[PDB]
Amino acid sequence: PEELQKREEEEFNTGPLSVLTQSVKNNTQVLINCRNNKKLLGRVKAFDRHCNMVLENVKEMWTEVKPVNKDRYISKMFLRGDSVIVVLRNPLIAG
Amino acid sequence: PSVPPRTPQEYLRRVQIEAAQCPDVVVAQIDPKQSVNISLSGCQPAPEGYSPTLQWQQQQVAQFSTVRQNVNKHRSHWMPKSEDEEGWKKFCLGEIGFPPLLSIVSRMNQATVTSVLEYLSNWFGERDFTPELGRWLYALLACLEKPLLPEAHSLIRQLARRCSEVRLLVDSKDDERVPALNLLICLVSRYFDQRDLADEP
Amino acid sequence: LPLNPKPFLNGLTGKPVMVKLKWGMEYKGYLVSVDGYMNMQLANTEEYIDGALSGHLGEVLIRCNNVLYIRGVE
Amino acid sequence: QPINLIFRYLQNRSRIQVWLYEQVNMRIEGCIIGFDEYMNLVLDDAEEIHSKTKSRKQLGRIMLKGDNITLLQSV
Amino acid sequence: KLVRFLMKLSHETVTIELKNGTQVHGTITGVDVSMNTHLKAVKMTLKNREPVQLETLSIRGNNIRYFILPDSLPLDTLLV
Amino acid sequence: DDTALIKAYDKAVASFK
């Protein structure tokens, strides 16, 4: 039917995409490696099969020429799945 | 049935049918540690009392927008070489050196605006903050057109950090620097969208 | 015994795998999970750039596209 | 079609080489034992052939994604 | 689905990182179902150039890294 | 006004109260 979609949600609460629904359900942060060769640390507000995402409180983090850490902040973001490489559940971050 | 398939399409149809018999999602239970990602800190909060009011920050942001309008009147009407760290420091700060007159900043292109900003931050790291410096930073920021490159976002966050750090050294709100520092922080944090650095009081 | 891509992959769950990505990095870990689109979830994940152990990532979702090949490990 | 090419190679259980899209410094080689409509291959007894350096890394049984594939040929 | 949400965003002005890294500030006239995005009132910022004004730009869904949304944007509302 | 930035700055520093 259309309630065979409720498999989808059973499939997100267990699939590999659980990693995301974690962050949505619990307001947790994740860390995505992105193809722009930078990392995005944020919370996931929403997502689809393709890893299209809406994120909150994102820090874009990267390095550059001896290499210096750089970053930048982004209140709200629509991230295309295409740009995503991998995604850490419970990443470990420090000052 | 219990023959094999002679054409690709048949084989595929045969695969497809097998692939519908399989479970679509499969999870395996395992039974039983992590690198760190070094992240740049935010802005060093303000000592008690020192944090400026929301209505003041909102006030300057609005005022700063206006200021940037005027920066395009003069900009239609048209220096060390762009790469000369040292000269740019001299040129601006001197011993004195030159103020940021529209004459001179409206003639500076974006990549320069940005480089200079770097040079005055590099000065600021190892020298004390003057009001001469305050003027230039304020100017160069007003001469930054947006959307900004990320390199340039990271730049002005660096500078906003450096301000919040210096603000801790102050010992009376009567310090000349305080307002200038609070401003630059407010501008980076509210005009240029890095609200993760902003002084929410 | 023609082995096909879905069943082969479903067959790797539970076990150690080495996923290798389009862009030259590879990741070893225990293949926790797998979906229709061949996304994957690894535990005890280890990153290797140029073959050099780069980091220890723990739990990790890998988007399907980025995968070049996957293979099992002992 | 590229599929018909493969299909056969599966009949012979031929050993094949694969040219990758993103990567030029490298070829994959193996004996093919399954595939699907997106041209993902199960590949047995498989190897990374580095160019220049003439080296070859044993992988064993792998699944190669179909989106990666420039070209297929026999060995 | 998430593309339903993007299509609710006309007249919102945004910034877009393109895949080549170009930053593209503009106002959304339309987003289609494959994420192609038409803009107006556009300002493009390029690594080694000065910027660029343009009355309009239209952009390939698959040429986008991500959208930077306006902070005031009310998400919970649009996520339905 | 050529020094209009310089002015706007000081006005802006000044205005802290």
Residue numbers in the entry:
A (entry chain B): 13 to 77, 88 to 117
B (entry chain 2): 42 to 73, 79 to 124, 135 to 151, 174 to 279
C (entry chain F): 3 to 76
D (entry chain E): 16 to 90
E (entry chain A): 2 to 81
F (entry chain M): 35 to 51
What does the paper say about this structure?
The assembly of snRNP cores, in which seven Sm proteins, D1/D2/F/E/G/D3/B, form a ring around the nonameric Sm site of snRNAs, is the early step of spliceosome formation and essential to eukaryotes. By binding the outside of the horseshoe-shaped 5Sm and constraining it in a narrow conformation, Gemin2 helps 5Sm select RNA substrates, allowing preferably the cognate snRNAs, containing the snRNP code, to assemble into the inside of 5Sm to form subcores; the assembly of cognate RNAs widens 5Sm, which in turn causes Gemin2′s release and allows SmD3/B to join to complete the assembly of Sm cores.
We also reconstituted several other 7S complex variations, among which the most significant one is Complex B, a derivative of Complex A without SmG and with Gemin2ΔN39 (the N-terminal residues 1–39 are truncated to further test the effect of the N-tail) replacing Gemin2. In the crystal lattice, although SmD1 is still in contact with Gemin2′s CTD of a second complex, due to the absence of SmG, SmE at the other end of the crescent Sm hetero-oligomer is far away from the second Gemin2′s CTD for interaction, eliminating the influence of crystal packing on the curvature of the Sm hetero-oligomer. However, the curvature of D1/D2/F/E is little different from that of the original complex as indicated by no increase of the Cα-Cα distance between the most conserved residues Asn37 of SmD1 and Asn55 of SmE (28.6 Å in Complex B versus 29.4 Å in the previous 7S complex). So, this observation indicates that the narrow conformation of 5Sm bound by Gemin2 is not caused by crystal packing artifact, but is a physiologically relevant one. The absence of Gemin2′s N-tail did not change the curvature of D1/D2/F/E. These data demonstrate that Gemin2′s N-tail does not play a role in the narrowness of 5Sm and the narrowness of 5Sm is caused by the rest part (residues 40–280) of Gemin2.
